Design a protein around this ligand. Structure first.
Ligand SMILES: O=C(O)Cc1n[nH]c(=O)c2ccccc12
Length: 167
Protein backbone atom coordinates (compact mmCIF):
# COMPACT_ATOMS: atom_id res chain seq x y z
CA UNK A 1 0.00 0.00 0.00
CA UNK A 2 1.18 3.62 -0.74
CA UNK A 3 -0.13 7.24 -0.14
CA UNK A 4 -1.25 8.07 -3.73
CA UNK A 5 -5.02 8.76 -3.86
CA UNK A 6 -7.65 9.19 -6.60
CA UNK A 7 -5.61 7.64 -9.46
CA UNK A 8 -7.17 5.64 -12.28
CA UNK A 9 -5.31 2.34 -12.82
CA UNK A 10 -4.26 1.90 -16.48
CA UNK A 11 -2.09 -1.21 -16.14
CA UNK A 12 -0.46 -3.43 -13.54
CA UNK A 13 2.07 -0.63 -12.79
CA UNK A 14 0.84 2.66 -14.36
CA UNK A 15 -1.69 4.99 -12.72
CA UNK A 16 -2.95 8.42 -13.90
CA UNK A 17 -4.72 11.42 -12.35
CA UNK A 18 -5.73 14.97 -13.36
CA UNK A 19 -3.49 16.87 -10.99
CA UNK A 20 -0.92 19.63 -10.59
CA UNK A 21 2.31 17.69 -9.97
CA UNK A 22 3.52 20.46 -7.64
CA UNK A 23 0.34 20.21 -5.46
CA UNK A 24 0.52 16.42 -5.65
CA UNK A 25 4.18 16.32 -4.54
CA UNK A 26 3.47 18.74 -1.64
CA UNK A 27 0.58 16.48 -0.43
CA UNK A 28 2.24 13.02 -0.89
CA UNK A 29 5.98 13.82 -0.31
CA UNK A 30 6.82 10.87 -2.57
CA UNK A 31 10.25 9.21 -2.46
CA UNK A 32 10.78 10.36 -6.10
CA UNK A 33 9.24 13.18 -8.13
CA UNK A 34 10.29 13.31 -11.79
CA UNK A 35 11.18 16.65 -13.37
CA UNK A 36 10.79 17.30 -17.11
CA UNK A 37 14.33 18.61 -17.31
CA UNK A 38 16.52 19.90 -20.13
CA UNK A 39 20.21 19.00 -20.49
CA UNK A 40 21.30 22.27 -18.82
CA UNK A 41 18.92 21.81 -15.85
CA UNK A 42 17.58 25.30 -16.59
CA UNK A 43 14.18 25.13 -14.90
CA UNK A 44 12.33 28.02 -16.55
CA UNK A 45 8.81 26.90 -17.34
CA UNK A 46 6.35 24.04 -17.35
CA UNK A 47 7.06 21.28 -14.82
CA UNK A 48 10.67 22.40 -14.18
CA UNK A 49 9.84 26.03 -13.63
CA UNK A 50 6.76 25.10 -11.60
CA UNK A 51 8.71 22.56 -9.48
CA UNK A 52 11.62 24.97 -9.15
CA UNK A 53 9.34 27.88 -8.15
CA UNK A 54 7.79 25.63 -5.45
CA UNK A 55 11.33 25.08 -3.99
CA UNK A 56 11.91 28.88 -3.84
CA UNK A 57 14.69 28.41 -6.49
CA UNK A 58 16.65 25.94 -4.32
CA UNK A 59 16.27 23.33 -7.12
CA UNK A 60 17.95 25.77 -9.58
CA UNK A 61 20.79 26.59 -7.16
CA UNK A 62 21.51 22.87 -6.63
CA UNK A 63 21.20 22.22 -10.38
CA UNK A 64 23.66 24.97 -11.30
CA UNK A 65 26.27 23.42 -8.98
CA UNK A 66 25.56 19.96 -10.56
CA UNK A 67 26.14 21.31 -14.08
CA UNK A 68 29.24 23.28 -13.09
CA UNK A 69 30.73 19.99 -11.77
CA UNK A 70 29.41 17.42 -14.29
CA UNK A 71 28.43 19.28 -17.46
CA UNK A 72 25.13 18.81 -19.24
CA UNK A 73 22.97 15.70 -19.22
CA UNK A 74 22.32 13.66 -22.38
CA UNK A 75 18.93 13.79 -24.12
CA UNK A 76 17.32 10.56 -22.81
CA UNK A 77 19.42 10.73 -19.61
CA UNK A 78 18.81 11.68 -16.00
CA UNK A 79 20.32 12.58 -12.66
CA UNK A 80 19.10 12.21 -9.11
CA UNK A 81 19.15 15.38 -6.99
CA UNK A 82 17.35 16.55 -3.90
CA UNK A 83 13.56 16.71 -3.81
CA UNK A 84 13.78 19.75 -1.51
CA UNK A 85 10.36 20.43 0.12
CA UNK A 86 8.53 18.34 -2.51
CA UNK A 87 9.94 14.79 -2.30
CA UNK A 88 12.92 12.88 -0.95
CA UNK A 89 14.57 12.92 -4.38
CA UNK A 90 13.98 14.57 -7.73
CA UNK A 91 14.81 12.47 -10.77
CA UNK A 92 15.59 15.03 -13.50
CA UNK A 93 14.84 13.25 -16.80
CA UNK A 94 15.51 14.74 -20.23
CA UNK A 95 12.97 13.74 -22.82
CA UNK A 96 13.53 14.86 -26.41
CA UNK A 97 12.24 18.34 -27.18
CA UNK A 98 10.43 18.22 -30.55
CA UNK A 99 10.65 22.11 -30.64
CA UNK A 100 14.54 21.64 -30.77
CA UNK A 101 14.36 18.81 -33.42
CA UNK A 102 15.45 15.91 -31.08
CA UNK A 103 14.84 12.23 -32.02
CA UNK A 104 11.46 11.08 -30.56
CA UNK A 105 12.98 7.51 -30.37
CA UNK A 106 14.90 8.97 -27.38
CA UNK A 107 11.61 9.08 -25.46
CA UNK A 108 11.89 5.35 -24.69
CA UNK A 109 15.45 5.86 -23.37
CA UNK A 110 14.14 8.72 -21.18
CA UNK A 111 11.42 6.53 -19.65
CA UNK A 112 13.93 3.72 -18.99
CA UNK A 113 15.40 5.92 -16.23
CA UNK A 114 12.18 5.39 -14.25
CA UNK A 115 12.97 1.66 -13.92
CA UNK A 116 15.79 2.50 -11.45
CA UNK A 117 13.12 3.61 -8.89
CA UNK A 118 10.44 1.38 -7.39
CA UNK A 119 7.77 4.14 -7.17
CA UNK A 120 7.64 7.58 -8.82
CA UNK A 121 5.34 10.58 -9.23
CA UNK A 122 5.85 12.00 -12.76
CA UNK A 123 4.50 14.17 -15.65
CA UNK A 124 4.26 12.85 -19.21
CA UNK A 125 7.70 13.18 -20.74
CA UNK A 126 8.25 15.22 -23.78
CA UNK A 127 4.62 16.50 -23.41
CA UNK A 128 3.56 20.11 -22.96
CA UNK A 129 6.22 22.59 -24.07
CA UNK A 130 8.54 19.73 -25.20
CA UNK A 131 6.21 19.36 -28.19
CA UNK A 132 5.51 15.58 -28.36
CA UNK A 133 2.06 14.02 -28.64
CA UNK A 134 1.00 13.16 -25.05
CA UNK A 135 -0.97 10.10 -26.28
CA UNK A 136 2.30 8.75 -27.69
CA UNK A 137 4.17 9.64 -24.48
CA UNK A 138 1.63 7.65 -22.41
CA UNK A 139 1.97 4.62 -24.75
CA UNK A 140 5.80 4.70 -24.48
CA UNK A 141 5.50 5.04 -20.69
CA UNK A 142 3.21 1.98 -20.42
CA UNK A 143 5.41 -0.04 -22.77
CA UNK A 144 8.73 0.95 -21.11
CA UNK A 145 8.29 1.55 -17.36
CA UNK A 146 7.98 -1.61 -15.24
CA UNK A 147 8.13 0.11 -11.82
CA UNK A 148 5.12 1.80 -10.28
CA UNK A 149 4.48 5.18 -11.83
CA UNK A 150 1.83 7.70 -10.81
CA UNK A 151 1.30 10.15 -13.69
CA UNK A 152 -0.01 13.68 -12.98
CA UNK A 153 -1.80 15.11 -16.06
CA UNK A 154 -2.14 18.94 -15.88
CA UNK A 155 -4.82 19.59 -18.59
CA UNK A 156 -8.29 18.17 -17.56
CA UNK A 157 -9.18 18.07 -21.29
CA UNK A 158 -5.97 16.13 -22.06
CA UNK A 159 -6.48 13.82 -19.05
CA UNK A 160 -9.96 12.90 -20.39
CA UNK A 161 -8.54 12.32 -23.91
CA UNK A 162 -5.67 10.13 -22.57
CA UNK A 163 -8.15 7.97 -20.61
CA UNK A 164 -10.78 7.76 -23.39
CA UNK A 165 -8.17 6.78 -26.09
CA UNK A 166 -6.12 4.33 -23.92
CA UNK A 167 -5.77 0.85 -25.40
O1 LIG B 1 0.22 17.44 -18.03
C1 LIG B 1 -0.24 17.71 -19.16
O2 LIG B 1 -1.37 18.15 -19.35
C2 LIG B 1 0.57 17.51 -20.42
C3 LIG B 1 2.01 17.74 -20.11
N1 LIG B 1 2.89 16.64 -19.94
N2 LIG B 1 4.22 16.93 -19.62
C4 LIG B 1 4.76 18.27 -19.49
O3 LIG B 1 5.88 18.40 -19.27
C5 LIG B 1 3.82 19.46 -19.71
C6 LIG B 1 4.23 20.78 -19.59
C7 LIG B 1 3.32 21.82 -19.79
C8 LIG B 1 1.99 21.54 -20.08
C9 LIG B 1 1.60 20.21 -20.18
C10 LIG B 1 2.52 19.17 -19.99
Amino acid sequence: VNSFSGYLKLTDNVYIKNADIVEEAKKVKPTVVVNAANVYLKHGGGVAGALNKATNNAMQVESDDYIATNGPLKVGGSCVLSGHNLAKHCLHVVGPNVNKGEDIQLLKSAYENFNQHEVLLAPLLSAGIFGADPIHSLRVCVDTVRTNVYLAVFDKNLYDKLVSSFL
